[PDB]
């Protein structure tokens, strides 16, 4: 079949992709170096820096949340099982590290038919680690739109129209808003996200970001992981 030396053409990848509008996203699915960064200037303006958000106080409570995940502060919806019909390409999930979830039947069994059977699903249901699986996940809509689930994210309190829901490490804004409590996806801090192959695709405005080796702890254990920051 079609081969580009790897990372996305495996029996367990849901290749249910509709580029009827001819918006070139299939080139990105097939070449990791291909991204579409048009419209990134506008989109980034709506994303806010952490200082502009209200400070947080009291206990932290969990929250349930929109349409675009490009911002570090997007409040993901908690993960569930999604039908393979609605996914194009690989689905990446973040331990904090990048890990790939493949197509399965409704009972966790591995299925090898490129998400073509209607039984085929992506079971992305999450409990935060260490006693769990991953903090969040990110894939592509069958029509080329990035989709992120994760959490449940964090309410840190605060008052105003500037109040913040933390899906990352927000220790400045609240000392208990640490990734191990509040992480809900690939955003390690407000300024950094986990580096994986289809990151230029899923998050195309991180293209000028620089890659660093970063170090973090989850529940007192250490992960050394490459991530992109700017």
């Amino acid at each position: 079949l079609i081969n580009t030396n790897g990372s996305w053409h495996i029996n367990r990848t849901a290749l249910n992709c509709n580029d009827s509008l001819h918006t070139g996203f299939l080139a990105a699915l097939f070449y990791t170096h291909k991204f579409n960064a048009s419209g990134c200037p506008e989109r980034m303006a709506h994303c806010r820096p952490i200082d502009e958000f209200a400070q947080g106080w009291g206990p932290i409570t969990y929250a349930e949340g929109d349409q675009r995940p490009y911002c570090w502060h997007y409040a993901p919806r908690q993960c569930g099982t999604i039908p393979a019909s609605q996914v194009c390409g690989p689905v990446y999930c973040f331990t904090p590290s990048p890990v790939v979830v493949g197509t399965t039947d409704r009972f966790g069994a591995p299925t090898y038919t490129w998400g073509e059977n209607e039984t085929d699903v992506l079971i992305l249901n999450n409990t935060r680690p260490p006693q769990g699986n991953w903090f969040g996940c990110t894939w592509m809509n069958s029509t080329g739109f990035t989709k992120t689930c994760g959490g449940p994210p964090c309410n840190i309190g605060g008052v105003g129209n500037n109040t913040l829901t933390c899906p990352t490490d927000c220790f400045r804004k609240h000392p208990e808003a640490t990734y191990t409590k509040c992480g809900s996806g690939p955003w390690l801090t407000p300024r950094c996200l986990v580096d994986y192959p289809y990151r230029l695709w899923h998050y195309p405005c991180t293209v000028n970001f620089t890659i660093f080796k970063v170090r973090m702890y989850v529940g007192g254990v250490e992960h050394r992981l490459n991530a992109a920051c700017n």
Partner: antibody
Amino acid sequence: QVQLQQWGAGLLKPSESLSLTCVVYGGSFSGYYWSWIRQPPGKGLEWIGEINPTGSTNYNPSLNSRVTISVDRSKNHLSLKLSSVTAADTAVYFCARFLPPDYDLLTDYFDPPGAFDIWGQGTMVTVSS
Amino acid sequence: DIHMTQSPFSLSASVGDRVTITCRASQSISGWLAWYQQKVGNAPKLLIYKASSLESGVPSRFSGSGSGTEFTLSISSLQPDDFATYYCQQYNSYPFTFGPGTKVDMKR
């Protein structure tokens, strides 16, 4: 994973221009620092220059502003251009990637990079009139 | 520009020898020194960065110590895989400059 496949050159003559490419296999070009280094034959290493993740370049003044480094994001390509070539410029040319800087998440600070961890096998440029 | 020198130019060793070679700098380069190995016809390999930190996949035989104007690379027990020309590089200032190399060869 990341590899550097380097593409060769032809015979050059002085006053000509040189253009050499290197294609990043194993991963994208993004987020990395890339540099060009040359070794005259029998001699040792000289740093031609660098490109930062957002396109900005730094060049060695010993090239007398006759050198250009670039990245073609459309084809995953790293290029080196050297105008007004002289027989002095006969050397092996290497593409290398900077070692990813260490980043402290809390301080949001890192050392700016200068070590080359992946190197392309290098390719000869002979320049004689 | 910062001038990098090395001693010795040529060292003749045998397996099991501890080899120590020094790099020196015209101006203080702090810790921003890297050490590379190059075997003939092949590309340079990174061994040390930050003058003490060892890049992954290179063995513990290789040690780096130094600061300011003087730095040093050492093999605790040379092995046949360790005969090459060894180079130092500052990344303190632009232009990034290299040392002229130290060749370690077989002893007979």
